[PDB]
Design goal:
Layout lengths: L9 E10 L2 E11 L5 E12 L3 H15 L9 E7 L2 E7 L6 H7 L6 H20 L12 E5 L10 E4 L11 H6 L6 H5 L6 H16 L11 H9 L13 H7 L10 H10 L2
Antiparallel strand pairs: 1-2, 2-3, 3-5, 4-5, 6-7
Helix pairs in contact: 3-6, 3-9, 6-8
Bound molecules: the ligand Cc1ccsc1CN(C)Cc1nc(N)nc(Nc2ccccc2)n1.
The ligand Cc1ccsc1CN(C)Cc1nc(N)nc(Nc2ccccc2)n1 binds next to strand 1 and strand 5.
């Protein structure tokens, strides 16, 4: 169970945008830290309306279950504020933010070896989740959080974490799932009860496309109905700008869920692109 954080100890300072039935802020948590030291810690706050009770329960159960698994590539959630009519996730503030925005701000002036390192780190996160049989369900480049930029002098790569899962596609409205094509795989559009570990392999492919397309969104020109039809017609994504990951994307975006390769196999493939 998440640590409870008092509303009194949270300051809200900036409105940052919106997720799926969430409102996002930057703020400050006043906390007693290690050694009893008082810290004012920058935090990312995700606010759910308690009136959307089913969405809130799904969101916080998903965040809590994944935060039980401490991992270098999984975002740190500090706890939850049951803040009256709203429930608030208090998450670490990642310095460089979402990867899709980062790639746009840097005009896709990143090389293929940087892309490979990010892809490997995500695959290692996904392998850990697979070993724990924990479905994420919302893998995408906006949910790749850049902790550190590369440092050419030390040779250190960029370093990422995967964000929390959000509301489950098993409870979201069908129209939201359709807007999330081609991250949500064809079997889950057909029936959201088809959610499975295989879901994340498909979404990982779509996320590799994003990484290799400088933060562009695939199928952005298609409305919900044309995206539903895109799956009816069994189409695949176009090859990305950086074509080096084209094969891996196609192998992951397999319309047969049982044919999508394991994360361990994906890691081996990424390693061999060298
Ligand atoms: C921020 C946001 C907007 C819509 S969704 C969402 C949350 N998340 C997907 C992105 C995120 N998560 C975490 N934990 N930290 C950050 N840092 C950050 C934020 C803004 C600028 C620079 C850095 N960004």
């Amino acid at each position: 169970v998440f640590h409870k954080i008092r509303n009194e100890d949270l300051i809200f300072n900036e409105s940052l945008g919106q997720g799926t039935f969430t409102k996002i802020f930057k703020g400050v948590r006043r906390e007693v830290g290690d050694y009893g030291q008082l810290h004012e810690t920058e935090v990312l706050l995700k606010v759910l309306d308690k009136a959307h009770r089913n969405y809130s329960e799904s969101f916080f159960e998903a965040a809590s279950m994944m935060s039980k698994l401490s991992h270098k590539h999984l975002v740190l959630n500090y706890g939850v504020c049951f803040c009256g009519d709203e429930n608030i996730l208090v998450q670490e503030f990642v310095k460089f933010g979402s990867l899709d925005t980062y790639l746009k701000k840097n005009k896709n002036c990143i090389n293929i070896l940087w892309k490979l390192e990010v892809a490997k780190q995500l695959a290692w996160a996904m392998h850990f989740l697979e070993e724990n049989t924990l479905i994420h369900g919302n893998v995408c480049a906006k949910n790749i959080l850049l902790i550190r930029e590369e440092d050419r002098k030390t040779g250190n790569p960029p370093f990422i974490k995967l964000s929390d899962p959000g509301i489950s596609i098993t409870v979201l409205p069908k129209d939201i799932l359709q807007e999330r094509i081609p991250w949500v795989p064809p079997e889950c559009i057909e029936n959201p009860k088809n959610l499975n570990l295989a879901t994340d392999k498909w979404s990982f492919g779509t996320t590799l496309w994003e990484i290799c397309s400088g933060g562009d969104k695939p199928l952005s020109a298609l409305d919900s109905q044309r995206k539903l039809q895109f799956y009816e017609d069994r189409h695949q994504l176009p090859a990305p700008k950086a074509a080096e990951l084209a094969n891996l994307i196609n192998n992951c975006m397999d319309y047969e869920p049982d044919h999508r390769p394991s994360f361990r196999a994906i890691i081996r493939d990424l390693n061999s692109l060298f």
